[PDB]
Amino acid sequence: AGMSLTQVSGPVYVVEDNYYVQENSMVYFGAKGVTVVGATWTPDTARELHKLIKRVSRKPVLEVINTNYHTDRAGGNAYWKSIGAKVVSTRQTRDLMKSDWAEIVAFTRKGLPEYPDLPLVLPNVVHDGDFTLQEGKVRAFYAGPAHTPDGIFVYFPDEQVLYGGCILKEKLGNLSFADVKAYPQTLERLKAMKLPIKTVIGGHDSPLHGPELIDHYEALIKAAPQS
Ligand SMILES: [Cl-]
Ligand SMILES: [Cl-]
Ligand SMILES: [Cl-]
Ligand SMILES: [Cl-]
Ligand SMILES: [Cl-]
Ligand SMILES: [Cl-]
Ligand SMILES: [Cl-]
Ligand SMILES: [Zn+2]
Ligand SMILES: [Zn+2]
Ligand SMILES: [Zn+2]
């Protein structure tokens, strides 16, 4: 299908969004409603995700997290706002989105001319630090710059699942925005947290991995140009 939504553990589901360059995002089905992690590529893809969510739960979509300011993590924002879902990010992500959205949309359209010229839609719930949702069962944190300066991790302690967003994935990918020297330093700060991790969800390529995805990408990035 163009998009799938599949349980990985309990209330934690993975979205494989096959539009444009495949991106993987998360959904958490909570007591009071649904938290989406990664807004997906466009308002149309967001609508496609919402359609899958409505086949699983009647509960409202409470909030959507932009794990960085880029199109693959924030492009759905217009749709999520339109349905009354909060759009959540760190202050850093919101500030970079305000200044650099036009730039990332233009860069997106270089590779994907078919991608729409989306207007800026900023998060409306902004956090100054690390933050949690769903009674502490969805935990977002900053551990330094990697694919972008602002990208955050999201951890689900009950299921021991770590969402890597654009930071963790199978192939090196494009490094145009990346801090290549800091990248492994961020991954090592992450490892030093010693979070219990059974599953890492990569934000591109095939999503389901073990904790060794962190080590896999770390070795890749340490070999890259500008490392
Ligand atoms: Cl329901
Ligand atoms: Cl439910
Ligand atoms: Cl353009
Ligand atoms: Cl990121
Ligand atoms: Cl592998
Ligand atoms: Cl694996
Ligand atoms: Cl791996
Ligand atoms: Zn990006
Ligand atoms: Zn990405
Ligand atoms: Zn793997």
Curated annotation (Swiss-Prot):
- Gene from which this protein is expressed: cphA
Origin species: Aeromonas hydrophila
Superkingdom field: Bacteria
Q: What is this protein called?
A: Metallo-beta-lactamase type 2
Biological function: Confers resistance to the different beta-lactams antibiotics (penicillin, cephalosporin and carbapenem) via the hydrolysis of the beta-lactam ring. It is able to hydrolyze penicillin and imipenem, but is much less active against cephalothin, cefotaxime, meropenem and ceftazidime.
Q: What induces it?
A: By either cefoxitin or imipenem.
Q: Bound how, and how many: what does the cofactor note say? A: Binds 1 Zn(2+) ions per subunit.
Specify whether Metal-binding is a keyword of the entry: yes
Gene Ontology cellular component list: periplasmic space
Record's keyword annotation contains Zinc-finger = no
Cross-referenced CDD domains: CphA_ImiS-like_MBL-B2 (cd16306)
Ordered alphabetically, the record's keywords are:
Antibiotic resistance, Hydrolase, Metal-binding, Periplasm, Signal, Zinc
Q: EC no.?
A: 3.5.2.6
What InterPro entries does the annotation carry?
A: Beta-lactamase_class-B_CS, Metallo-B-lactamas, NDM-1-like, RibonucZ/Hydroxyglut_hydro
Q: Name one GO biological process term.
A: antibiotic catabolic process
Q: Where in the cell is it found?
A: Periplasm
